[PDB]
Design a protein around this nucleic acid. Structure first.
Ligand SMILES: [Mg+2]
Length: 1268
RNA sequence: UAGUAGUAGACA
């Protein structure tokens, strides 16, 4: 009932007081926090940091390894098969046995080759045999392994095995010798990798992309070496099973030239496990590092390189498996960007070198390189800006040991590139070309950065790193509390305290007057839309049940009760919901739950986000009362946030780019024309300086208590303060939290047995050794809408103070705040008399006017930063860049109105992130991410190439590819093109059709081509396809994208048959979430036992190799394999006979489901004009479950639940009828159950749902304009 | 100086 609370009393805060303080503070000399970029300054920073680094780390004479797998190719590579594998293994063992071992690695290789070549005939028959045909033997225990005891192991081999089963340094980068050696080595490797080995969309692809990219790259040794690495990694993954990992293995590739020896290892299924192997190759061009080779045996006029015993984890193994494609996709993206930039096609040598560099980066999956590229992606914007904090970025760059010889090469490259950039046409990073646009260079380095997989950090020395920041800032907060008193820090310091001390204006301390005036400036705007504000505030689920929302049902992850170990349990949200519902007697609303759990202390943990940044960020797992309080605050401020612009987090994930582009366009429109200043006119030029700003420590270095005062003065449309007081109390109860250290960190501390001083300082934060109190720091991600709104309010307060300071100048300001990320557009005035006016103003008693005489934007930013510090927002000196032409926001780059959104992240993620729901499901998902890239800016040719790559990957993984086990052609009497996708199918579909028509069209189109065959011709093959479709329909009906497809704590509280009966009885609950306690509890128990939920709660990517031959599909309510499903499909289609109802359904579906004809029906021709690139912009594409819940609603409880769920309470009936009409345009329970976008265009294109399709048709050609 | 990782002792 929203009980009353302690509402805060406003105090006498006056804007004039802040204006006077601003006058006094601006009347003196201020130190700019940014440095003007120069070639001399950047070079001096590099030299000084080199000198310091020479003594920071101990020198290392021997550069360390950087290539995970070493192999060499001199002829074209043919993919390996079982027969070729056996022949090559025989040849390779014969070659190896005629060599003299020198090192323990060579001795072990010789011993294993001798053992393999002496395996009996039955062993070699069972070796290479399929799983079904395999039989156990003395010498062979698994299809691709053999045993090796100590009896057949030499003394040296045993010694090296003991070495396996048993202080940081750096290279002298300041030395020219080390740099020269590293550059020469990496240049040799790249030159070896560049060597040559000796519809309308289809025609455009073959003319532009195939001719100039694929045909050029088909002969490079990088291409064939990528294929060879794919084969080697496939063999390694096959060995990494839970059964095969304990044995030895031997494989050979490329006519016995490359040999892989797999040592016993822990299976990659277990966490923190490595697979150990040795690769022996003939010395030649390729990924050869002579210094890091274990040995180079000398055969007769030949050299055999034996590499070191490499231990590779699952992440790096899966990265190496798909690295030909990550290199190919990156090269295609670079090709498209070069075409956009220079307007012509890249030459052969440039594209070959780019592909070689991308392949080398994809192979060397090392954390040091990932950190270097993470630093570089911020360093490049700093040196191309007018003022930036580049010295700090260079210092952070020099904070790493350059152990590998690749890191020295990349460091030399980035040093040269940054020195060249600061001295100025934008030089490229991996080529000798020079770009015409900064967006191309920044996209190139971003693409290089995205080639590194997420989670390359040390598994153990990162859980401490994620804790250190929180502990350090909590200690700083305690120090401030002891220095200034608990009351001052919690409630904020008065304005006179700031005027007297002047050291109070820092982080974790806020000024009450600043908060109040910021709230006043925001509610001045809010007074115009108070009605909408109240409507949005009341529109949230204040009185709705708490656990009937989707977020509280999800599996995201939350904490549990404190256990006897003293640690905080890690459960899922659904489990905590079930627990509380079981203990409670009713399902309370948000406010009722908050009142129930108000007295409980907020507890939290931290877990890794698994990013690719230099330092891994950890996100916090909060308990249930903490989640309730944060949801209250977030709902309130999000409701307020939407009705105010200049904050771009309340906006949807898709409207942010449109909003920021509109803001930039408004800034550009204002910049047009001049301004007139009254002499007391004078003409003044209107300038435009963007400031891409970031906060130093958004969450850790803030004081959440400030929001209290904000919420006490923010004006909403509500008549009473009950909700505002509830939000204030929720803010009060989230002030102090119990930060719990993880179990891994506790075990790490326990195993130490002797603590370093800094580990002791970290540990004393936790008194009992498990949890420590953290004050004033809202945990990361918990308060983002509120923080963005507060930042916008502070910016508006600064704008008001500036306007009151100099009313004679009509300056222009915009602010964009997406949490810590921000963009400040400053339109100031520049003289074309101004100095005389400034002198007169100074002599008139306005001592603060002298800050505007020259470079007024400096003083504007100084005042803005100080006013932001009057809260707790510290603009980061490092990652904030000012520039008069460019901007960076929301991970996108703006050239005025032009927008450049990276689309590489989802193109590369198509292969690396497969959902695993099912063959059709994951194939559609992978095809969907190519559509998203096509929306974000990828050209149709690049999207087509990427989609071909990922569907080839899915076909290879599931065996659907022709010639393999699960090829439907050999068991379904079809041509593999007339096969439904859920039962195989080609899956090759034009990206245009997926983008426009839909993803499942490849099935539906077939249906049409079936029906036209069955009606006009009555062919038996069409009847067979119809039977296949009927089998899919039957499976979809039996088991219950959008198409027909073919243990825990509380999961055992209700019987499975009880769940089935309940689901059959309460049909409506399949579409709506219940509201009563018992019904919601049963719904949640059923949700726990859903196979998709259990599977969802990468390891799946690795385990799919074994899952391929196991029973994963569902047939007649039984778990069966895919091959049996295909055989059943063949039998049922052969025994299928047509019926009237099926024919009627097919005619209705084919008549009601067309866009393909328009795509290929339009004409195209090359206009005699070269393609010109314009400033790209963004366009847009231009409750239902409740009515279905109404349809099956029978009981009073279900009727009440569906009534509450619907946005419109009593309109459902009418809506249902209208929906029925819609269905009749495109009633029975069966048919009812079965029925159940921003694109980066060029400037000219319209925003119609067909205009974007026409633009995509235009964009298929990359260098030539076309006409429709 | 077997690998990954690391100016947090890990995988073991
Ligand atoms: Mg930024």
């Amino acid at each position: 009932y929203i009980p009353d609370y302690k509402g805060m009393e406003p105090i006498g805060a006056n804007i004039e007081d802040l204006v006077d303080y601003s006058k006094d503070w601006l009347s003196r000399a201020r130190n700019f926090s940014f440095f003007e970029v120069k070639g001399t300054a950047v070079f001096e920073c590099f030299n000084s940091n080199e000198a310091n680094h020479c003594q920071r780390y101990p020198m290392s004479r021997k550069p360390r390894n950087f290539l995970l797998i070493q192999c060499s190719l001199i002829t074209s590579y043919k993919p390996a098969t079982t027969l070729s594998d056996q022949i090559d293994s025989r040849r390779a063992c014969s070659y190896i046995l005629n060599l003299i071992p020198d090192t323990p690695a060579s001795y072990l290789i010789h011993d294993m080759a001798y053992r393999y070549i002496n395996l009996t005939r039955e062993d070699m028959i069972n070796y290479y045999a399929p799983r079904i045909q395999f039989k156990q033997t003395q010498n062979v225990r698994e299809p691709g392994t053999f045993k090796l005891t100590s009896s057949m192991l030499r003394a040296e081999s045993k010694a090296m095995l003991d070495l396996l089963n048993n202080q940081i340094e750096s290279l002298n980068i300041a030395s020219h010798i080390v740099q020269s050696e590293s550059v020469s080595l990496i240049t040799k490797i790249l030159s070896d990798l560049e060597l040559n080995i000796t519809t309308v969309l289809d025609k455009f692809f073959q003319n532009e992309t195939q001719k100039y990219l694929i045909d050029v790259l088909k002969k490079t040794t990088a291409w064939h070496i990528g294929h060879l690495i794919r084969d080697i990694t496939e063999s390694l993954i096959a060995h990494s099973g839970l059964k095969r990992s304990k044995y030895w293995s031997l494989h050979s590739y490329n006519n016995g030239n490359v040999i892989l020896f797999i040592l016993p290892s822990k299976s990659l299924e277990v966490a923190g496990s490595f697979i150990r192997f040795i690769t022996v190759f003939r010395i030649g061009p390729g990924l050869v590092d002579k210094d890091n080779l274990d040995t180079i045996l000398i055969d007769g006029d030949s050299q055999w390189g034996v590499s070191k015993v490499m231990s590779i984890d699952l992440n790096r193994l899966l990265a190496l498996n798909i690295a030909f494609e990550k290199a190919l996709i990156a090269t295609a993206t670079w090709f498209q960007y070069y075409t956009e930039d220079q307007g012509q096609f890249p030459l052969q040598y440039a594209i070959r070198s780019v592909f070689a560099n991308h392949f080398l980066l994809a192979i060397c999956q090392k954390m040091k390189l990932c950190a270097i590229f993470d630093n570089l992606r911020y360093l490049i914007p700093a040196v191309t800006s007018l003022y930036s904090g580049f010295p700090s970025l260079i210092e952070k760059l020099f904070e790493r040991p350059f152990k590998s010889s690749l890191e020295v090469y990349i460091y030399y490259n980035i040093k040269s590139l940054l020195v060249a950039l600061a001295q100025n046409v934008y030089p490229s990073f991996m080529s000798r070309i020079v770009y015409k646009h900064y967006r191309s260079l920044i996209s190139e380095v971003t693409t290089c950065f995205f080639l590194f997989e997420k989670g390359l950090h040390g598994n153990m020395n990162e859980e401490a790193k994620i804790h250190l920041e929180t502990v350090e800032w909590a200690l700083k907060f305690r120090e401030k509390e002891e220095k200034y008193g608990e009351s001052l820090v919690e409630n904020g310091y008065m304005m006179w305290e700031l005027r007297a001390n002047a050291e109070l204006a820092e982080q974790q301390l806020y000024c009450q007057d600043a908060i109040e005036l910021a709230a006043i400036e925001l509610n001045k705007v809010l007074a115009t839309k108070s009605s909408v504000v109240a409507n949005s505030i009341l529109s949230k689920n204040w009185e709705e049940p708490y656990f009937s929302q989707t977020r509280n049902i999800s599996l995201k992850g939350m904490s549990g009760q404190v256990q006897e170990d003293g640690h905080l349990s890690s459960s899922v949200t659904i489990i905590e919901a079930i627990r509380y519902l079981s203990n409670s007697r009713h399902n309370p609303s948000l406010l009722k739950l908050y009142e129930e759990t108000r007295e409980q202390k907020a507890m939290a943990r931290i877990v890794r986000k698994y990013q690719r940044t230099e330092a891994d960020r950890g996100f916090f797992i909060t308990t249930l009362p903490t989640r309730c309080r944060l949801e209250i605050i977030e709902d309130y401020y999000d409701a307020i946030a939407k009705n105010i612009s200049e904050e771009y987090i309340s906006y949807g994930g898709e409207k942010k780019i449109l909003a920021i582009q509109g803001a930039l366009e408004k800034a550009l429109r204002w910049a047009s024309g001049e301004s007139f200043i009254e002499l007391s006119f004078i003409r003044m030029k209107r300038k435009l300086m963007y400031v891409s700003a970031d906060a130093t420590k958004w969450s850790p270095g803030d004081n959440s208590a400030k929001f209290r005062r904000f919420t006490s003065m923010l004006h909403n449309g509500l008549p009473n303060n009950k909700l505002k007081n509830c939000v204030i109390d929720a803010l009060k109860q989230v002030y102090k939290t119990d930060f719990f250290m993880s179990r891994k960190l506790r075990n790490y501390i326990d195993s130490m047995e002797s603590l370093d001083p800094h580990i002791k300082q970290f540990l004393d934060f936790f008194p009992d050794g498990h949890h420590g109190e953290v004050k004033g720091n809202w945990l990361q991600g918990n308060l983002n809408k509120c923080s963005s709104l507060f930042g916008v309010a502070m910016s508006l307060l600064f704008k008001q103070v500036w306007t009151n300071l100099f009313p004679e100048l009509d300056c222009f300001f915009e602010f964009a705040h997406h949490s810590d990320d921000a963009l400040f557009i400053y339109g100031y005035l520049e003289p074309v008399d101004w100095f005389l006016f400034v002198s007169q103003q100074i002599q008139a008693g306005h001592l603060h006017w002298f800050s505007v005489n020259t470079e007024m934007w400096k003083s504007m930013f100084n005042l803005h930063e100080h006013i932001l510090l009057l809260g707790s927002i510290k603009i980061s000196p490092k990652k904030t860049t000012v520039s008069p032409t460019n901007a960076e926001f929301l991970s996108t780059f703006f050239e005025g109105c032009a927008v450049s959104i990276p689309f590489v992240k989802i193109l590369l993620g198509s292969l690396s992130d497969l959902p695993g729901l099912g063959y059709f499901d994951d194939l559609a998902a992978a095809q969907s991410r190519c559509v998203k890239a096509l929306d974000l800016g990828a050209s149709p040719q690049v999207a087509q190439l990427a989609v071909a790559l990922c569907t080839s990957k899915v076909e290879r993984l599931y065996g659907t590819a022709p010639g393999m086990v699960n090829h439907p052609a050999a068991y379904l009497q079809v041509k593999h093109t007339d096969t439904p996708i859920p039962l195989g199918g080609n899956g090759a579909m034009s990206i245009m059709e997926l983008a426009t028509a839909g993803i499942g069209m490849s099935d539906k189109n077939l249906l049409k081509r079936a029906l036209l065959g069955y009606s006009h011709k009555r062919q038996k093959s069409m009847l067979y396809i119809l039977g296949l479709f009927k089998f899919l329909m039957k499976l979809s009906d039996e088991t219950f994208q959008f198409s027909f497809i073919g243990e825990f704590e509380f999961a055992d509280m209700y019987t499975s048959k009880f769940l089935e009966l309940w689901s059959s009885q309460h049909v409506t609950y399949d579409y709506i979430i219940p509201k009563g306690r018992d019904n919601l509890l049963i719904y949640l128990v059923r949700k726990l036992n859903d196979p998709s939920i259990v599977t969802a709660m990468l390891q799946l990517r690795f385990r799919m190799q074994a899952k391929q031959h196991m029973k994963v599909c569902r047939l007649d309510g039984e778990w069966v394999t895919f091959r049996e499903v295909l055989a059943a499909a063949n039998s049922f289609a052969e025994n299928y006979s047509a019926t009237s109802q099926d024919m009627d359904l097919f005619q209705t579906l084919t008549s009601c489901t067309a866009w393909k004809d328009f795509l290929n029906g339009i004409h195209c021709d090359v206009i005699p004009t070269k393609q010109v690139q314009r400033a790209k912009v963004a366009r847009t594409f231009t409750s239902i479950p409740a009515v279905i819940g109404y349809k099956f609603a029978v009981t009073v409880e279900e009727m009440s639940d569906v009534l509450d769920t619907a946005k419109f309470p009593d309109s459902l009936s009418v809506d249902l009828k209208t929906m029925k009409d819609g269905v009749y345009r495109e009633s029975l329970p069966d048919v009812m159950k079965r029925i159940a976008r921003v694109v980066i265009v060029q400037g000219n294109v319209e925003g119609t749902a067909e205009a974007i399709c026409r633009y995509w048709l235009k964009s298929m050609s990359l260098v030539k304009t076309i006409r429709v």
